């Protein structure tokens, strides 16, 4: 599997629902990639997309991702706590074990 | 394509030329071998009948 | 093809919650926000009815 | 685990188990008596004896170094002595182990990666593979287990430099425009000058790619020097696990200027970089050179410049994929011949001797 | 003493609060409820004719997840069937597996829309009957048809736990949050410019302290008070799940004792 | 075998508290200006402020009861490295797996040197 | 089958020094073939 | 054109080589695997090689090594001799 | 392609408006903009333009125009996804059946 940013990935394991970090809302990740596939492959778009996808949370406003627009990180962030979450994507997480 | 081909095969044309901007052809070629030998028509590209 | 039924992350049934969904975003002048009126507090699965493609009306018309 | 190519190790702790070591070899990380226990079930060859606690005060606590130094053999010494280091600590700086127990500084790539006098190197080589072979099993098992319940990750926030301290970034960038202004126009009055290596047009190109390159470092160096030490991606780097100073500066500060065959974005067509520019626009505001990072981030008139610089190391990676192989076979096909004869000498197929030692 | 302090309830979820208990037990209850809680679900279809658009393979997987009534379950013989694996009968028998039917045809020319309603159990008031999450509807959607596209399916349900396939757990998710401020600092919040300023207080945050001081922070303190919130699918009433949670969690501790005091 | 090795009062003049959550290195200075001491110590459980006063002890045992009860902070770590500079005098650097020690005073005290770990004891 | 044992590949046994692995993965695990040679003019015989 | 060398005036290294160990253990393996006279109290093994290794440790294994020199001469070494 | 040489295109209308205001001296207002694509301001000489580009986002592959936030990656990553995208999976034609 790979996203739309050239994060060629392969499945390594299949954890059942309990094991996975059920947190805290509390949902469970459908898949989870590793943080070392970021800084070196500089692919800050993968990030942005995820902060924005989220924001089609309590909105459903299909969030446009148009190549060159005024839309900024600092912009979407404000739109975040706007729904009660962290203006930066993050969240606290509870271990499955 | 880009016949050719059998006349290198080091750089030229492969490399991206300023000229491409527009009918770009952005960055969407095969991984290695035939890099930048294949290209795709932009969204606005119009070819001369 | 047709709603997934049962969201991908939780279990929250979504087979029931579409014949009724579509009858708001195009039939009640309420927002994408209107689904909130269907018990969709989590992300989560609620991106299920939302990110969905009705691929059967446009497939069903091939009659043998 | 140690090729003679370099008489240095070729495998070492890397990726998550490595990022983990740092974030756990810190003397900020204590272990609750609650486990400890749990994590003691990897070693995998356990004394059976539970390590004597380092803290007997109100709660009983174990330092992260303690239980780590457990999975290192008994009786290997190291005096790493990094840069600045004093009779003091002074601040977890350096590294030093004794009877198979650390006591000093912090574990990172510096020591559990294929380093020269590397810890991996040092038990190999005393006392041969295994418990040597177990070393990778212990740390790569203990730590993974620690990390499982320590959690670690990165989001955008880890990429967005301080708002105040970002004003000062954009200041030292636009403050290097003036340093080109005093070059684009001052070398139209023949007051360069040039030399050596030539030429005059080139020794101009030089005094710019120099200012643009150095001017960037300042923006990036400040962007990092203003990021909490505990900022994901910055710690992922300190560890060594993945990525580097130039990865952070490009993500949160600027990016350009990008190159190509040893010369900033080339002209052609005509006397101009592109059709959104005058002519003779020997300025960065056009010729390959971005001011923003993958956050704002890139501007059209820029986006392309970047993609076409990208497609160079994108074919230069298409070569090393084949050529590198061609040159390999050359050597082999002329050295298969040689080998060390039981006499203590290396000789040809035909017996024609090429060395009188085993390698001098 | 107490142990639980419920707030709101509904028909699909049960918000409440644990009191005098430990972290372990909390989680170990979260888990229990999400996995090993016997339920009915369909786990075998035989197709006769199907000229619809959903393939047979695609129906099985879909007809599966559709919830069914379970209620009591762990109370044989009737009003509850024991796993079809360890049954006193052979192969498959109604004494340990409930039969379901689906004979959908077409009498129209416009378009058909077959829901969970059209199925047919047997009349053994098990149950049994699926569910109708929808408000005065007919149940979760199954498949669409045009002209003559009748399908004929034989479905029989067995007994199973999430572990065996996510199909069974009658439980959506769970929403716990022990220590909502940051007493025990079981977490290092990422700043980015000012700590207690970026992270949102939680609705469940208004039930505690310890702001002010600088005590300094305690440590003899263990995590107690857990704000859970169980939500069911609609397969079996909203706990139910919880109630039946410990019943097969105590009995999981027992297994142990008995395998150590007998010998 | 009562082998006490420290019975002197110290005081705090500086505390960091340098981008570490827990742990904090403190400074002593007592007696005739020529004492000074410095160590890392969990600032989560047992914080210390200026003019903290109150002595400390070390030893290596073990059996006593009062000493065990007294104080509200106890540690345990080898010494490894005890050199001498600037008018004889001894300086000892003991490590408690990460958390580090430093003292500057001549023979008496000296019953130390021995590296056989230490057990540090703090009473307020 | 089968797989493929490149020139590249073989040059690596030689580095380690495995006469026997090498011989095994080229003259046994692929073409195990035996023939009978005349001692004067080394050629295929009328063997049975 | 061989020449043979004096079991009394041996030149080469008294120690057993990285490669030899590998060849000997390889050789006895096949031998024992071929039902052969095992020369040390059978510890209770199964693996025709893991057994040969039991032998090597006790230097109670037959086989000798002829080390051809460039000259064309050779030397014979006994497993019990080697190191 | 050969007609470009003799032409002078603009990037965004905003740039054209700024140039028109300068032709008579008009404030720039650079102390009001927030996190965004820092353009090259103001405008080097160039008294009047000739054409202006429709939108810089039509300068894209057919398969690369599907990638969130294209202008934001490291470039090399951009080249990917497109070539791999073709290897994606999904419905290719309403009438595959």
Residue appearing with tokens 């030539």 = D198
Of D16, D148, D294, the CB nearest to A44: D294
Give the up-direction half-sphere exposure of residue C33: CA atoms within 13 A in the CB hemisphere. Answer: 6
DSSP letter (8 states) at residue E186: -
Q: At what angle do helices D132-150 and D16-25 cross, to 10 degrees?
A: 80
Q: Which of I14, I26, I18 is nearest to I42 (CA)?
A: I18
Cis peptide before A24 (omega within 30 of 0): yes
* Helix, strand, coil percentages, rounded to 5, for chain A: 25, 0, 75
In a shared domain, residues D7 and D135:
yes
Last residue of a domain, one of E145, E166, E187: E166
Residues of B in contact with D275 (CB under 8 A): 21
Round to whole Å and give the CA distance between C20 and E216. Answer: 55
CATH number of the domain encompassing residue E71: 2.170.120.12
In a shared domain, residues D20 and D164:
no
Q: Counting one residue from C and one from I, how many pairs have CB atoms under 8 Å apart?
A: 8
Residues of H in contact with D343 (CB under 8 A): 11-12, 69-70
- For E172-191, b/e burial (b = at least 16 CB within 10 A) is bbbbbbbbbebbeeeeeebb
Give the up-direction half-sphere exposure of residue D159: CA atoms within 13 A in the CB hemisphere. Answer: 32
- For I14-26, b/e burial (b = at least 16 CB within 10 A) is ebeebbeeeeeee
Round to whole Å and give the CA distance between D349 and D11. Answer: 34
Round to whole Å and give the CA distance between F47 and F23. Answer: 9
Q: Which of A91, E199, E143, D173 is nearest to C60 (CA)?
A: E143
At E176, is the secondary structure helix, strand, or coil? Answer: coil
Round to whole Å and give the CA distance between D143 and A12. Answer: 19
Residues of I in contact with D304 (CB under 8 A): 59
CATH number of the domain encompassing residue D285: 1.10.132.30
- Whether there are 3 or more C-beta pairs closer than 8 Å between H and E is no
Of A25, A53, A58, the CB nearest to C33: A58
In a shared domain, residues E16 and E68:
no
Q: At what angle do helices H50-57 and H18-33 cross, to 10 degrees?
A: 120
CATH number of the domain encompassing residue F117: 2.40.50.140
Round to whole Å and give the CA distance between H43 and H48. Answer: 12
Residue of B nearest to D276 (CA): B21
Round to whole Å and give the CA distance between C34 and I5. Answer: 54
In a shared domain, residues D1 and D149:
yes
Distances (CA, A) of E128 to D100, E64, E98: 65, 14, 7
DSSP E strands in chain B: the ranges are none
> How many CB atoms are closer than 10 A to CB E201?
11
Round to whole Å and give the CA distance between F12 and I94. Answer: 78
In CATH, C1-64 is 3.30.300.130: no
Q: Can you give the residue range of the structural domain that contains E232?
A: 1-38+167-263
Q: Token digits for I72?
A: 């934001």
Q: Counting one residue from D and one from E, how many pairs have CB atoms under 8 Å apart?
A: 17
Round to whole Å and give the CA distance between E150 and E52. Answer: 7
In a shared domain, residues E152 and E231:
no
Q: Can you give the residue range of the structural domain that contains F58?
A: 1-124
Please report, for chain C, the start and end positions of each structural domain, with discontinuous segments joined by +: 1-64
In a shared domain, residues D142 and D241:
no
Round to whole Å and give the CA distance between D318 and D322. Answer: 7
Contact F21 E188 (CB under 8 A): yes
In a shared domain, residues D164 and D149:
no
In a shared domain, residues D121 and D223:
no
Interface test with A, best of C50, C52, C53 (most A CBs within 10 A): C50
- Intra-chain end-to-end CA distance of chain D, in Å: 25
Last residue of a domain, one of E109, E133, E166: E166
- Annotate D271-325 with DSSP letters as a single string: TSSSTTS-SS--STTTSS--SS-TTT---HHHHHHHHHHHTTTTTHHHHTTTHHH
- Domains of chain H are 1-83 (3.90.940.10)
- Number of structural domains chain F divides into: 1
Round to whole Å and give the CA distance between E36 and E245. Answer: 8
- Number of structural domains chain E divides into: 2
Residue appearing with tokens 């004889």 = F88
Interface of F with E in 7-36 (CB under 8 A): 21
Is E215's Cβ below 8 Å from some Cβ in A?
Answer: no
In a shared domain, residues D159 and D278:
yes
Report the DSSP beta bridge partners of residue A27: A23
Last residue of a domain, one of E149, E166, E183: E166
Q: Which residues of H touch D (CB under 8 A)?
A: 11-12, 67-70
Contact E141 C5 (CB under 8 A): yes
Round to whole Å and give the CA distance between B24 and E129. Answer: 60
Q: Token digits for D71?
A: 């999975």
In a shared domain, residues D106 and D195:
no
In a shared domain, residues E160 and E43:
yes
CB of F53 closer than 8 Å to CB of F33: no
Q: Can you give the residue range of the structural domain that contains D31?
A: 1-153
Interface of C with E in 28-57 (CB under 8 A): 39, 42, 56-57
Residue appearing with tokens 């052969």 = H36
The method recorded for this entry reads cryo-EM
Q: Which of F33, D21, E143, D154 is nearest to A90 (CA)?
A: D154
- Annotate D61-110 with DSSP letters as a single string: EEEHHHHHHTTS-SSB-EE---SS--SS-TTT-SEEE-BS-EEEE--SHH
CA F104 to the chain's CA centroid: 11
CATH number of the domain encompassing residue E248: 3.30.1360.10
In a shared domain, residues D236 and D147:
no
Backbone angles phi and psi of F67, in degrees to 5: -55, -45
Q: What element of type H or E holds E39? A: strand E39-50
Round to whole Å and give the CA distance between E231 and F25. Answer: 49
CA diameter of chain C: 43
CB of E20 closer than 8 Å to CB of E237: no
In a shared domain, residues E99 and E189:
no
In a shared domain, residues E191 and E248:
yes
- Characterize the bridge pairing of strands D339-341 and D345-347: antiparallel
Round to whole Å and give the CA distance between E17 and E206. Answer: 13
In a shared domain, residues D109 and D241:
no
Helices (H), chain C: 22-25, 46-50, 57-60
Q: What element of type H or E holds C60? A: helix C57-60
In a shared domain, residues D53 and D100:
yes
Of A44, A70, A74, the CB nearest to I72: A44
């Amino acid at each position: 599997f790979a996203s739309r940013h050239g994060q060629k990935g392969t499945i390594g394991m299949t954890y059942r629902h309990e094991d996975m970090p059920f947190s805290a809302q509390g949902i469970v990740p459908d898949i989870i990639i590793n943080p070392h596939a970021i800084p070196s492959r500089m692919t800050v778009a993968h990030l942005v997309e995820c902060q924005l996808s989220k924001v089609s949370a309590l909105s459903g406003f299909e969030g446009d991702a148009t190549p060159f627009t005024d839309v900024t990180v600092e912009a979407v962030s404000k739109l975040l706590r706007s729904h009660g979450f962290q203006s930066r994507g993050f969240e606290v997480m509870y271990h499955g074990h | 394509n880009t016949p050719i081909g059998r006349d290198g095969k080091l750089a030229k044309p492969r490399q991206l030329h300023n000229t491409h901007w527009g009918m770009v052809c952005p960055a969407e070629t095969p991984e290695g071998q035939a890099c930048g030998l294949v290209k795709n028509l932009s969204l606005m590209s119009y070819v001369s009948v | 093809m047709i709603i997934p039924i049962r969201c991908f992350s939780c279990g929250k049934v979504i087979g029931d919650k579409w014949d009724t969904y579509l009858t708001l975003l195009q039939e009640d002048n309420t927002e994408g926000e209107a689904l909130d009126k269907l018990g969709l507090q989590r992300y989560c699965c609620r991106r299920m009815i939302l990110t969905h493609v009705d691929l059967i009306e446009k497939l069903l018309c091939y009659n043998p | 685990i140690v090729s003679p190519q370099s008489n240095k190790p070729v495998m070492g702790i890397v990726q998550d188990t490595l990022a983990g070591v740092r974030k756990f070899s810190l003397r900020d990380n204590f272990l609750t008596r609650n486990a400890v226990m749990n994590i003691m079930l990897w070693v995998p060859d356990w004394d059976g004896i539970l390590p004597p606690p380092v803290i007997l005060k109100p709660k009983v606590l174990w330092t992260g170094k303690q239980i780590l130094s457990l999975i290192i053999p008994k009786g290997i010494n190291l005096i790493r002595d990094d840069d600045k280091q004093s009779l003091s600590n002074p601040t977890d700086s350096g590294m030093l182990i004794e009877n198979g127990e650390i006591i000093y500084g912090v574990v990172d790539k510096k020591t559990v990666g294929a380093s020269q006098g590397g810890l991996v190197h040092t038990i190999w080589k005393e006392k041969g593979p295994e418990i040597c072979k177990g070393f990778f099993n212990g740390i790569q098992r203990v730590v993974n287990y620690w990390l499982l319940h320590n959690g670690f990750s990165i989001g955008i926030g880890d990429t967005i430099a301080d708002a105040d301290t970002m004003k000062e970034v954009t200041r030292t960038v636009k403050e290097a425009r003036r340093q080109v202004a005093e070059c684009i126009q001052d070398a139209q009055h023949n007051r360069l000058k040039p030399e050596p290596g030539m030429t005059l047009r080139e020794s101009f190109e030089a005094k710019v790619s120099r200012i643009l390159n150095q001017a960037r470092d300042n923006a990036g160096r400040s962007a990092e020097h203003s990021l909490k030490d505990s900022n994901n991606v910055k710690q992922m780097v300190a560890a060594g696990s993945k990525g580097s100073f130039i990865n952070i500066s490009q993500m949160s500060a600027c990016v350009g200027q990008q190159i190509v065959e040893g010369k900033r974005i080339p002209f052609g067509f005509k006397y101009r970089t592109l059709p959104h520019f005058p002519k003779d626009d020997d300025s960065p505001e056009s010729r390959g050179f971005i001011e923003n990072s993958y956050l704002r981030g890139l501007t059209p008139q820029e986006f392309f410049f970047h993609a076409m610089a990208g497609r160079e190391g994108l074919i230069d990676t298409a070569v090393k994929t084949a050529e590198t192989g061609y040159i390999q076979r050359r050597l082999v096909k002329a050295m298969e011949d040689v080998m060390v004869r039981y006499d203590g000498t290396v000789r040809n197929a035909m017996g024609d001797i090429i060395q009188f030692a085993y390698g001098e | 003493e107490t142990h639980i302090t419920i707030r709101n309830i509904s028909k699909n979820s049960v918000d409440f609060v644990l009191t005098n208990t430990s972290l372990a037990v909390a989680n170990s209850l979260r888990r229990v409820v999400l996995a090993e809680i016997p339920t009915v679900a369909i786990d075998l279809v035989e197709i006769n004719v199907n000229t619809s658009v959903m393939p047979d393979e695609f129906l099985a997987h879909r007809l599966g997840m559709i919830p069914l009534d379970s209620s009591n379950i762990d109370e044989p013989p009737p009003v509850g069937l024991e796993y079809t694996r360890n049954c006193d009968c052979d192969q498959y028998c109604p004494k340990c597996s409930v039969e379901l039917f689906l004979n959908a045809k077409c009498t129209g020319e416009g378009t058909m829309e077959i829901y969970a309603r059209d199925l047919v159990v047997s009349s053994n008031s098990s149950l049994g009957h699926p569910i109708l999450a929808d408000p005065k509807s007919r149940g979760p959607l199954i498949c669409k048809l045009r002209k003559e596209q009748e399908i004929s399916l034989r479905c029989i349900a067995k007994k199973g736990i999430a572990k065996e396939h996510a199909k069974w757990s009658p439980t959506s998710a769970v929403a716990f949050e022990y220590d909502p401020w940051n007493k025990l600092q079981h977490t290092d919040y990422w700043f980015e410019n000012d700590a207690d300023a970026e992270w949102p207080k939680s609705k469940n945050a208004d039930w505690e302290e310890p702001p002010r001081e600088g005590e300094p922070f305690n440590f003899q303190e263990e995590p107690r008070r857990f704000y859970m919130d169980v939500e069911s699918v609609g397969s079996i009433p909203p706990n139910e799940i919880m109630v039946q949670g410990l019943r097969i969690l105590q009995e999981k501790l027992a297994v142990l004792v008995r395998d150590l005091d007998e010998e | 075998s009562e082998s006490v090795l420290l019975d002197e009062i110290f005081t705090v003049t500086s505390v960091d508290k340098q981008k570490y959550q827990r742990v904090s290195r403190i400074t002593a200075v007592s007696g005739q200006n020529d004492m000074n001491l410095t160590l890392d110590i969990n600032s989560q459980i047992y914080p210390l402020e200026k003019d903290a006063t109150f002595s400390l002890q070390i030893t290596s045992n073990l059996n006593s009861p009062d000493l065990k009860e007294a104080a509200d902070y106890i540690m345990y770590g080898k010494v490894y490295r005890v050199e001498e500079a600037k008018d004889e005098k001894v300086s000892v650097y003991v490590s408690f797996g990460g958390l580090l020690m430093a003292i500057e005073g001549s023979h008496r005290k000296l019953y130390r040197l021995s590296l056989d770990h230490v057990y540090l004891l703090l009473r307020r | 089958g089968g797989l493929r044992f490149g020139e590249m590949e073989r040059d690596c046994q030689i580095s380690h020094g495995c006469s026997s692995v090498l011989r095994e993965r080229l003259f046994d695990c692929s073409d195990a073939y035996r023939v009978i040679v005349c001692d004067i003019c080394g050629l295929i015989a009328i063997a049975s | 054109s061989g020449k043979a060398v004096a079991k009394e005036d041996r030149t080469t290294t008294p120690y057993m080589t990285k490669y030899e160990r590998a060849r000997i253990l390889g050789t006895r393996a096949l031998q024992i695997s071929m039902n052969a006279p095992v020369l040390v109290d059978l510890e209770g093994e199964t693996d025709p090689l893991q057994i040969a290794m039991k032998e090597l440790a006790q230097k109670k294994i037959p086989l000798l090594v002829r080390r051809y020199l460039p000259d064309g001469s050779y030397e014979d070494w006994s497993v019990a001799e080697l190191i | 392609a050969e007609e470009e040489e003799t032409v002078m295109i603009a990037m965004s209308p905003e740039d054209l408006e700024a140039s028109r205001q300068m032709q008579a001296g008009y404030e720039v207002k650079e102390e009001l903009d927030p996190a965004q694509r820092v353009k090259p301001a103001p405008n080097p000489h160039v008294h009047a333009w000739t054409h202006c580009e429709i939108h810089p986002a039509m300068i894209l592959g057919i398969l690369a125009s599907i990638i969130p936030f294209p202008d934001h990656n490291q470039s090399p990553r951009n080249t990917y996804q497109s070539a791999m995208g073709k290897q994606a999976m999904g419905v290719y034609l309403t009438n595959y059946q």
